[model samples]
Target: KPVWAPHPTDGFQVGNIVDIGPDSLTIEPLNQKGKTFLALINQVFPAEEDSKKDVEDNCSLMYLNEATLLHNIKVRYSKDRIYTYVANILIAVNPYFDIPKIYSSETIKSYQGKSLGTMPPHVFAIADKAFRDMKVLKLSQSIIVSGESGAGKTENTKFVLRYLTESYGTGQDIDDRIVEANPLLEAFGNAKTVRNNNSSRFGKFVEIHFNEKSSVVGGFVSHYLLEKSRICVQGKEERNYHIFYRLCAGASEDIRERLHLSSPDNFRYLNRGCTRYFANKETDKQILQNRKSPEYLKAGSLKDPLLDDHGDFIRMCTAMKKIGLDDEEKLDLFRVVAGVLHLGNIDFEEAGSTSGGCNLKNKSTQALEYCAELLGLDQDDLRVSLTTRVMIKVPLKVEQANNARDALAKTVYSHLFDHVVNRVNQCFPFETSSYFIGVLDIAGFEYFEHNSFEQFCINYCNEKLQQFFNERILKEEQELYQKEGLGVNEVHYVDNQDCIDLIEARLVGILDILDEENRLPQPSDQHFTSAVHQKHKDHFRLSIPRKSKLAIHRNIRDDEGFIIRHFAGAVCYETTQFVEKNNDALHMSLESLICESRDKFIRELFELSFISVGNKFKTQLNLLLDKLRSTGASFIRCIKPNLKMTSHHFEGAQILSQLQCSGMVSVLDLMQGGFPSRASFHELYNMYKKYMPDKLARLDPRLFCKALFKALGLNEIDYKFGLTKVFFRPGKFAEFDQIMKSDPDHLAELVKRVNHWL
Candidate 1:
């Protein structure tokens, strides 16, 4: 017999109880014969070690405890099985290595028309089910892929899109266009993070529209929070969005001449971080022989198996062409991108005057000239906008002017990102959409040493998503059990409603207060921080940094930042840049200068009505949630197995937090006492009717279910019959489903036996 016990470092471990005492027991873990441990009988949870050790579903475990769930996942991951099922929810671990043939066309075909749990757990299985559900239920569906950074959320989302397009394509290029949207989006919206080599810097909900025939007709992409900050700065180990590097490395000489593009090292915005481009052996040699840049000499060569900037750029250009963007249009977009780089190089220096004004550094005057030329603005006007403000020009200090330059760069890049996404949406228009399958690939919950406006927005989004998960998986499942007359008790779980209110509720919420601060005559980060402390002094979910769980965070000044007790965990956010980041408005001088651009595309970027970044995101989030609420939703929670980002490595403690944060542990606990798999009696009979004997087919659907269960020798304790459906205990249905669908002859034999008994 197996038992659930705690480990000093691993959090939870599966062990055998070797000796029993009144309130204590001697335990030996699975692999360590000499490593016997002691535990209190009261603390140990009983577990049934079934003969089928590596079950596909966590619900199949005889005793679904946290320890057992963890053990099961680890066993499968060790064998390179990255995906597992917890009831209907899929838990996919980032294997950090390639697994060939797992997602091939054959795999897709095998999962076709297959119910979940009938085959090895795969991401394709979920996509197939979503498609099947939409076809049968005649409703839209959403697959929400959630995980921390580097957890393969983006990769899994791509697979889902591929599966749908490849399996059900209309034979028109509509499917081709739908799949091609990825490279263009990634070039503009994704970046290289320390954890993930290619990470999505923006959140996107890609909806693939299908006609009444269930063939892909068209698609639309809705993106969010384009991480404008990264356009200006990145960590030492990170790079800006892939477009910047790709443009520098892969552009034609004529294209480079027009844009005045230089090596990434020459641009202050890019050179601040690692300027090394992603390459391969062939491309590395190609760049060395042709483009001899200083960065290449300084940093030898950078390579990744899947990332080659030159090849990716060519692919991206082709994708853009396929999706209706001509060279002139793409060049226009690239000019804006190049203009941002030039703007970053326009450094400000102190003017020798008692008034403490600033002027462009003498060495950077050419940078300013190039920047103005590329942006199609008068050189003097662009210069004046950066160095002055208001109705009558008021000189700005050196630092203030520098801030203005960076803000302009961020603003322009943000506009360019939006335009790219808009263009992507326009290329795929659908007039006859019967339903859609929306794939939401957003960044998971984030917490860093110094959280700021971006983290606040991203984390708040995760909070709303977590609340959605709770409602759908926990609350709805229990409600179904009660409705079906199962005597399962309510499984008490943490409700994050209060936490969500603390962040997004009207009038007094954190975002509202931040928005109020932005509208102030003279807004300051400290003022915004103080306002939150004052408004929610006694709120349970709001706290000062002094109360943070981490010691470094506890040392933060009370006026510096506040901590939110997120559903995942507590994260302290520094508020120093909140006002500046949330207020996306450009200075009046800069706005008018751009509005006066010589290029129509440049002018149009500033024509949109300005909304505070926070409010815009809030609106976007609300619309997204509204859409999600209207659809049947499936969930895939990605887990990064280890921080090392290496293959075949598993860190138990790290994964434990992820599983707990994802609400998996609680789900398993709930499933322990509930039937997680079920089918209507009519549907169950219909599934096997083609192979049933004539007499068995004539029996009532309910009677047929009863006779079949009896003939199969199913334990009475493992199932319950409701008004019209049959629900089986966790993991119990797999056994019967296996025998029922293994072969037509076997199923006929079982039906024949049931007929004889009937």
Candidate 2:
């Protein structure tokens, strides 16, 4: 039987706040062997003795000193090169202290090592389990790998997909094709940000469906909004994703002619300081030549191309062509890019002395005219797309100048990009009851003195995730009561709203309340009025002034909100705020609806088929609830307000103490004796050998003893445990106790002997 153990700390440790990095915490079992048990410590704090008392009161322990025995075990871990060192115990040991699991500079050299490699154990474990179980259960499998940027989230996610494909290798060409698809996505989807040299700027969910043989059937992608505006504008110090520069700089002569792209050096948007880091005049020319050369392509191979990093852009353009984009439309899109470049180059001038109108010099006026012609639109239409405005009858007029021109260019570029993205999405078929593994590579929650729109969206996603945890763990538990024939009882599980609805509901909810006061006619009622008025007025008021306005109200269509609008090639919020607000209520309504949905969702799980119905049913229901709540929470939090404070501001220390006093810590203490009782280093070494005879034999005696002492909680002593006196040494067993008590050399020898005996 397994024993229960206390967490090293109560609650969860969000991680340490380092000087160079943001706050991070590790969640691991208090006892090493308990890793298989999925025990997580959500809190961190100073150690307490009674924490173990609670463990003893509730859970059974296999042995009295399991904690001490496990603690003294030595292992080497590294966080960075300088911090590389040995650890006695494995619990909460930083892997970076010695070596990294994936993408580590140290581990990079040993890609083929059994222990460390390009693909690590954790990635394989999750992917394999998901693939196998998903196949057997005929349900979609998902892996949610989340971490801050530069925390290896993107690299790890890529590895997971790679491992899955490798493990499921059928030696089919489709595998290669599927794998190649990634480069295409990355080229177009990812960008170079200040934090990560190569960062994914959007969220992507790839669904790999399988037929009876577990072979790839067909797959499609769902991508979140891309930061397309960054192409035309970027931070002073940062560069946009490499693809834009690479394409402009590296495109083959033929490709350049096809896209009508001018040289990067000629365009202000491409040649600006933001891109200087990548496009130093000399090196950039070489990079372009190298990228365009056939040698680069031949060396990398179709499986992995040296220039494959730019695959997504190639694919995007290729896809655009396949979708029957007319030459006019294609040129129109390129014109937007060109217009942006020109707009960036536009210089502001003082108003003309006589007319009081802004004067356009050089090619600014010509470029603006070309931009209007390319878009099949007038300058004013472009202006509204760029600037903020109230959606009133008779659009408000705004002054135009260099700033307006720049803004209009940016907006046109954004719209064109959004159109491309929507077209790409249209090429794929949507799956309703499909099982998908969504890999969200969105930006982390950021808290500035004042957060912006993007920050609000991201942090809201986090809140949804938290709400998901509550629903999965807590709400599901409540559902079990009903399943078990228990009486209906209310449980306050927070329901997660839909992602689309959340955005819409927030807007609509506020708007609805605003409308109730007669501040403005409800958007819907006004829209209805406008449609009827427009049809009748056109027929009856031919004599009225052509541009004259009537007082007739606007009629709103309920379906307008559902019409998808693109934001940088990705779908913007289509559902209304009203719809999203109601989704949470709908989710809570699931508590009552579970009986109806169970037949559809609850299929027999593979391995657990033999388990009793009561237990299995409860487990399945719990899993479903967990998935639902997690999904909902993620969706809602993405749009939550005042996100940083609302999502991550709980008092960690207070939670830790409460959990410690509530018998949680005692459970851990009983499994492993609370931290080892205080003792001299020598005494601690001897105690470990005496208790754990088996471990001492395989390990070096001196090092083993020191490791044991540290593991047993003896490292808190004033004196440091060093290599000379503490590391493994050779000796006989007979003089062990005497050596430990008197002579230092003798004590070292005894420690060695005891280590060998154990």
Candidate 3:
């Protein structure tokens, strides 16, 4: 007999575990309940033979791949033939998945479109429900979306705004106005990166609020750093985006002559490295023309005729001229970039410290002048910026010099790039709103053999997310236990407080404290040490290094956890040793708060209602809400993309589908159902927890499944139930081994059986 007996109603024949693999367990399905069931038993401890066999089988099931499974699931659930699929489940497997598809306006009629395209679906879903509930309850509120970079943070953000604008505004120029603002924002705020070609290097939040009539009353943009350094300096093989390159290249001929500039190709900083390898076929003039064309008309109005091609080009030239560069200065800037190019060409040399007066064999003086020019300042000022120290101004009293010139040079170059980007930002239209729809586009955790600062920070962010998922799941389970009549004290699990302190308080918490210290009235040893110790002492059990308390030992990779923080446009790393050591308290705090927040959020969403100004707006609003309601069992596309299996298996797709169905049905009943009292906080919470396992799990899965299948018309072929059951089990499955050795046909049959039994 299998270690765990199947539920009495589960219509499947019991079979021996046949194989096991790293990912799945294989079990031969038996005939029961008038049909043959192929149960791929999960959540079991597979013996050696079973484990090997299941591994082999999983290797053959192409659809089992997380990416492929996600794609298929999205296609199956979507009402519209075309829409952006932001899969939250797949975030762990590979955070950078291309899911958003842009459906041109021309294709909307025939595109089977529903919901706003390219928007984050989950946030939209929650906000819409909240808006309605708020209207009913007569309450005013806001929604916030926060996450690490490359987690579809930014794109999903845009969608929320788009949904609000479309739902509230008449399908007229007002909607167009909102849409038009996006490209202009992107042109200035977003940048190219190794992970995403058009990644948002900055942070932005846009809030849209509705008046009593459910119309857009107001909105605003809150922005952070712009990552200006990337304009001039990029990775070894990468090049700056076309905006900067184009601006420099497209300078009017007269301005170019005044700056003593020739072709963009002549500037080393503009044209060096791999950029030289690519053909500079496109010019600034061409880009400007394209921006003016009807195709690119979505980038807001060209209100400033000066912002038009000729005028803008001249304006840029005028700014360059204002730098007050004489002929020598002009030549010096070019010379610096040229020197850098030459520096790249030169080979490194090794010598004793005393032998280093000036390493440049013949061109050291010329290089210094060029460096000064590149920085848009005098050579001495450039030196100061690089060195991070004040220079002496006396005629002959100077004794010792600060040895930071090289560092200052790099800093000045970076600052100059930032200045240029800020100027560009000034050209865009600014909106004013309290709430914001923020989009975060950053890379995921990457651990190499020799991981560095970036790796730690990114992984730390993932750890925080993982902890969040755990807390959510545990909260639901705790509620389930309570509903089952088990006292809360009877449930023993990792405390949410502990997790929060370990992840957020320890990692994010410490970093925040350090940042505060850095910005103190006067940074002193006492203040720095006190702040560091206060945050780190309980979590990280180690004596603070006297030399540099913040400077962790380089070799402490495994023991010292890390978090990737996106401050402004730059990606930074924070250590998390403090959190891991104090996991219990941290987890408890986080879990409790998140649970409370989730409950409150759900309540807010269901209680809100909209009052239409007239019959037309009401009908339109109802239709929009209805269209959203039809999106059953497909909301996971809004959160993350890739879902995976672990010791405790959970199918993200199934959970999301279940939630989508329950939420939609519940929402539909409230909107169109005759009974008004049917919709309540209790019902919404119960349904939300049922579908979102991370939310609550006290309700019986069997009953939940029955309701879901009935509401959505889903059959065994449409979803997987047995997989979810096995996943919910406390332990791994023995049959997981057998499935690993099976062929695709065998695996498919197993999936079919699991679905039927559920």
Candidate 4:
């Protein structure tokens, strides 16, 4: 028998069982004669035939070993078939190119009304499945599209929306607005990054509400964790959010003049990164000639094929109008967008006097005035807020003053994002709806060179999502086997509950620890770092940075950062700014200054009660979890084929790591060890009764089910009988469902013969 033996360095090696021992196995290598290695019996897995390697549904693999799973995905990817089915879940690899003939209107129709595996694997099939389930079951549904950066999660989500709108849309105004939301949100919430051309900096859960008749009615959007840091700064090659660059490059001349916009290089906020706009080749020469668009000559300089700042701006405007944003409201939102840029340019300098205080640089006076004018704030009061503490009038040092300026900019921009989301939600009003389909497109697990507060929040979200995946895919699968009384052993997998507890447990969790540190009279990052260490000493999920697997993490002192064993992997987070970033409360001076603004939008934006970001995130996440729990969720795990983001490239090792991290390997193991597909006896009978003759219909569901299986010549090993259901092994249900859905004349004949024989 063939087997896969575990390798210390290589993940798994192809081998064949040569001999069996009490505790070890003698395995021969893949292509070497007279070469054998001793492997622990438990460390080797049985292998399937090569004929089954490229099966569309992994559950069909007789062995379902990790090596075979990896090979199957690779083989399929090589064929330009980037989507595969793992039971109900879909595994999609980023093709890095829009493969032709896929996702067209005709393709969408091909997937409509068909069961998931009946058609070739596609995101549309998942969308169609969710719709079919909702229409039949009358329950809400959620499609969670998840992956790392550049993994095509967002694009897959868009395809899901496209499928829904094209397949089931009422062709009303709501449908247009639903589709247009993508451009508006992408313009404001996405940015160019090193890994991807357009990356969403926020988490979005969009609900497409449907009336009782199963037509799209309206929609609602729930967003979370906008990356506030990007507002003030971005990495060297990265740019700020697309809205900043979009407005600078695409706004009308009159509006640009009104906002005092000039060359992006002239603005402090925009100048820190690549200032080149994503333009078409025809306009490239003109952009280079225009002094306004600097950095056009930056190396590796073809504009991103997916991005078009000018065209995007036009679509953004149309989207806004479709969502009912008026001309004045557009100006109001844009003024804040421009005002934040001006706020970033307000520089500070140390005073020349003995009293410890700072003064605004004379060169920044114009910038400060423009900020105040754009925001409708009193210039003097805005200046005071930047320079002095409330009530005491204590002057801030130069660094502290600059910090205030950046904080204001971050607040304005983040709230502006929220305001736009709120406006979008208002336009899609679903007062009464029978069911809704929700699509979750969010950042996946991230472990960077130096992770921080943002990673913590994102990883925490992923932790919860991972837990959900385990529950739905693994735990539930095994539960079905047990509930059906199948004589199979449970397949063991890692449960991330402890990791979640370490980060989100009551009071002693990391968020609570961070919150306590924030509440300290003199909160310090050093203190917070130590507090986490002291409180969770010996915590399996928590450890000092030195304990990390990577040498870079080992270089960080215990007092500087800590590591968490996340479901994905261990990530070391630097704690230098955790305390500062967690303190979401605005200073009284700044609050009052903004509250005194004449503009209603500015006044309303800052009116919310203060809450730390950690606390808010927990609340939002819980609400989101509750929403997801109420619905039947389908998962799409997007995978990046390579780090270079090149087309037609495949990297097996890295892709394997992602699959393992995403729990795909374990899912295969669980499916192999137990039944992964089941249908209650009643559901089975009801599904086929419509096509059955009276004699077959009158028979007991149990007898009818057994006779039908016998008539189909299904093996005893293919399925098991339970008190109330029939549980099938992986990939068997598709076969069973297809047979049941055969032509009514054929099914009736089969059922009549089986019923008469019984």
Candidate 5:
């Protein structure tokens, strides 16, 4: 191969002159005609170069510009270096496997009292920084972890939670309860998808509330847009939620008998994808062959309560029991899960009339019976639920009956999920100071070949989050800097307002139009689709695209679909069922039967699920947006290293798209300049005064801050003290951080600060 590649205008693909030609050298494209200027290593006073850590931190030398940023993330990830920093934000490239050494308790010990950059960026460092900021400044925080499915966001979330729990106090039941509830959430809300072995199928925001005393009081979890449709239908080779599989494969014999649970292959929904259990002959061979290895014996281990459970079957059951799930409730939870499977097995035979209700096929009798028995409903009542109408009057067909059956399954599971959330919330010792740290492990930006309303909601939520991030990081500092003093240039950002506008617009937006159509007489999906196309045709990035390949095949009913140009990518969504799903219409027949359940929780769940509004998820997303706006937030943009989901292989182009799509790289690049941190004079003076010995009442807050800066010996250009506030332009934050790092004396001082405030 020729030693030639295109020059990057003048590329930094560095090389030394082996022997200098006797003429002047020049830089040109792809080693252009007689160009010899590639001659220096830029060594200063010797043949030595700077350290790699120095290069890593000051990435301007790396000249990130997207390509370099992505390359460094990829190269470092392969070497088990999964975390990288652009200023303060942590970009996590999921290493397909774990490095236990990287996150040991001792390693966490090392990150304490350390600022973000002093450590080679770990999740612990981020968590600790959030922790330190709260203690030092008394300001609340939120850590927003985002990425695609299969990216290790849940794991990173667990790490941050663990660091916070352990760092602030010794293991208390209440503190451990917050951590314990996570596995339970994962088991219930996460699932296996084409993209991930362990994917979070829902969005969860856990706010670990605090008191002015800075102790762990409790946490409030806000769940958003659960992919309830996953219960009845799963993508090829993708199982339903983890709880289904775990309950099927690992629940006790009595549970097995009661829920009619059997081998994973026996359940209708479980068998649709693959089996519930993952240990295949190949996996068995690996385990047997590698029996002595710690990896095999570890993870959701057979022992150890706190450090145990690989977050699967035994792990979940253990967590549920720990979270105080009584046998009655556990039985109720599984019965509904198993009930959904059995409900799915309910089949409908055409009743031989255009508008006639469907009759159950002979084979579906046992299925209907098992479903009713488990869920505590009369079989005839269940039959009525399986073939009836409530909201949308349908031209009766076998497909309509089938739709009703599936709708019941989806509704039951959705309610079951909500009940679980309510139970988890009840366990929390709720607090009220507004002094809390919130962790948003929301669903990542997703784009699939055949996306749905769920994906639409998820992607829109991501858009909102992207916008939130742009405001908090890229946009907020500009406003603050411009507000206080001049000379701060606007940070460049990929503002997704156009996409957001289309999704969240009031009268004519996608969601509003759906709600609008829902209110019409004889509401139908076709009408909704038409209304959306007509209204949003003029809007940028929203259109009725050609039919998808899946929709092109034979017997593709209701071929209309629309596409939205999401910040990640455009995703096509089928409109055939959007109206029904939006209605969440479980039919009055099904609703009455569900109300007949003996179990209080079961009835309660049904009640919650059946109470339908035209646009609950969009409303939920708005509530979530409100939470994000009101809280102080940091972000972890999770990037799936490869689509293949294998270790040691980084798909450069795919990762690049994700970084670009999620606006990670743009935010990272933007953070290199302008302001990185800001605070009002009241916040700074009130926060730091606990450390000062002088009486500060005579001094104004800004002067107090100035004196405090003097006490710490900070330079003028390092920061700006405006009339009302203090703004630390990039390097200044780091410099003041050094003063904050006084090593031996800071911890006691920080605790003292909190104590004084308390």
Candidate 6:
């Protein structure tokens, strides 16, 4: 077994640390030969195993430090256990397959209405807590489920939702409509990523509404940002959104022929000519282990998922019936879905340069024709939309013609996604139920092999969510002083506002500047980068482009890219395609084609009444955050046990990295035990003045503080006195707040003393 130590130059690396001298240690690289990267660690890490044979409730362990925390979580995870808790939070590890017995109807029964710690840790426990709290406190609630790409955040969300319906649900069976709705949602929004086969490509937050009493009423889902561009092109390792592949897998013979949808092989969007077709052995294993496409995987070809015998089309249509979509509406929606596929096949070739009018290939002409026929546009007009300048002023470089085609495809799919969401929303109409609990299955801070505008969008949301986690919910200061009016005001938290500012501040933010750039016609990715450089050069950790060396930024770090030192890690975003993606507009010539379609779904989709058109990601996110703020929240953190997606293979480093990145450790310590309860001398003196009037009457706070302890039977059993205030472990001084509130005698005394002094 190889141990890791800090490298002399390259930072941390796996190698042997040899003592060169008492003051120095030499780090020898396991694989490298040259002057071995040297380093030492009087450094970080490990210890402790106590009388807890790994408490499934990691928080209930009573005493925790990082070493003990990891050991306990790792131990439980080894015995095929995946869910744990840190106080009110549910910490889950993706077992990569169904742990059937763990979440059975019987298991759900056990957790129903049980107190948080009364039951061993489970997602159901978290759900029941939210359910109980909402009714008890007469407040709305939310459970934030989040983790990285392959972590089972989505499954955990479904588990919580399942328990909510079963525990408090009226009549009989858990809302079948609710459960089935998710499969359809998953088929639409999820896709195959390098990491996970059924990865949710968007952030979906669901709010389950309830009536006056605790009965499962209805639910509404808000989509934050759909990875629209992914509809056109996917990484070599991944697939397009599931609906595309689901349809391409060939529906019914009548439906398949009518839409001209054959196997995925015929679609250029589905098959981008990559040689290997997978990211690695790990990704290959991921595909093999995938529960998605089970019916197709039996054929055992790498491309077996291209088409399936499972009647997915029938299943989707069945769900359409359940959700109240008429056949007319359903078929019309599929036409546009089919049309977007055809549109992606249209390839533009350069006919000339500069004043260049590109031409569609003969192969693409058929695709263009099919797209036109479906959308009710003339083939010649659609051809121009695909190949030539519909824009008199917008950049008509040969590349822009292809950009137009891909943009149209993305726009079509994005609109279609919005339509599905709207239709599903109609099934669970919202009229403001008296009390509700939302289950927000959020994105883990997204970091992928290739980072893009979509990646930036997801990661930005995570940064904000983390800021929410660290500063408010899990931080003592926010709970103590601000919320409860008790604190020395000394406990501070990580203020991640700067990270948010870089992404979206008032004037100089990346998003605000992008908005400005989007408004200007024919803006290049280069121009967007230049404008950003001019405004945000002084912002922290950002490496801005130098005006004199704009083009020369080329040779650096593999190629020209924009770097954002995100809280998670530094990401160098490729600058070449960002403006086109940010300015994700379809060709002007074809805008009316879909907008005027006889197909009602297509027509309505194209004319969607956005809060503001053109810029969507940031707007949608702001709306989502607003919804989340209205609810009291609980948190869930999902951890991928191993990147390999294999059972019983818990890689320590990767798991630890995730724990650290998600801020799970810090949150645990905050929840378990603390001097979370505090009071400044001024607030303390004011509150205590009623109890011991004569002794606490002094105008000086320090004198009043000394008098307070002496008068109240001075002791240091559970409380500590600081220079400026007092600190206690919660319930230690809770009596004071209780005495201050609702005690008529104390209240009258307080008023009497103040009135007499006045």
Best by lDDT: 1
Q: Per-residue CA lDDT of candidate 1, range 1-758, in tens?
A: 77777776676777889988887988899877878888887668876556347878888777777777778888899888999988778999998878889988898889887777778888898898899778866899999998887888989999999999888877677777878899999999988877677877789999999888788888989998988888988877888999998888888888788788877878888887778888866787655333445767777556666787788889899999898888789888888888899899898878867546888888888888888888998889898899887645688988998898988888888888888888888888877799999999986676667788888888888888888899988999898988988878788788888887787778787778888887778788988889889874898778889988788898889899888887777889899888778877777777788888988989877752235788788889989999999999899989988876788888887888889888898888887778865778776787778887777767888777877788777778888888766888755645545544545677677767777775
> For candidate 4, lDDT tens digit of each residue in 1-758?
56778765445777798898999999998878897899998878777666344788988777777777777787898889999988778999999877888989889878888765778889998898799779867899999987888889999999999899878988777777878888888888898877777988888999999998999888988998888887887766788888887787778878888999876788888788877777776644433233254466554243665787666777788888887889998889899998999999999889858557888889999998999889998888888889887555688899889888988888788888888888888887876988999999887676668789988888888788878888887787677677767766777788888888877777888889888888777788998888788874887777888888888789998889988887677888899899888877777777778878898989988762346898888899889989998999899999988878687777776777889888888877766666655678787787678777777767898878887888777778887887677777665655655554545676667766676665
List runs of model 1 lying over 4 Å from the truth: 1-4, 14-43, 46-52, 289-299, 352-356, 607-610, 676-719, 723-758
Which regions of candidate 6 deviate over 4 angstroms? 1-46, 49-52, 60-63, 172-174, 273-315, 348-359, 387-398, 474-494, 519-522, 531-541, 544-559, 608-615, 675-758
The global C-alpha lDDT for each of the candidates, from Candidate 1 onward, is 0.82, 0.37, 0.34, 0.81, 0.67, 0.65
Question: What ordering of candidates by lDDT runs from best to worst?
Answer: 1, 4, 5, 6, 2, 3
Error of 3 at 556 (Å): 8.7
lDDT of 5 by residue, 534-618 (tens): 6635876765565333453223343367777777777777676676667765567667778878767677875523333335766
TM-scores for candidates 1 onward, in order: 0.90, 0.45, 0.44, 0.91, 0.81, 0.76
RMSD of each: 4.1, 21.2, 19.1, 3.5, 7.5, 8.8
Q: What TM-score would candidate 4 get against the native?
A: 0.91
Residue pairs with backbone atoms closer than 3 Å in model 1 (clashes): none
The residue pairs that clash in candidate 4, if any, are none
Model 6 TM-score relative to the real fold: 0.76
- Off by more than 4 A, model 3: 1-134, 137-153, 170-182, 224-233, 237-242, 246-388, 391-758
lDDT of 3: 0.34
Whole-model alpha-carbon lDDT for candidate 1:
0.82
Error of 1 at 543 (Å): 3.2
Query: Residue 632 in candidate 1 has what lDDT?
Result: 92
By TM-score, rank the candidates, best first: 4, 1, 5, 6, 2, 3
Give stretches of model 5 more than 4 Å off.
1-64, 280-311, 352-356, 388-397, 431-434, 524-526, 543-559, 607-614, 678-717, 720-726, 729-758
Look at candidate 5 and give me any clashing residue pairs. Answer: 299-310, 300-309, 300-310
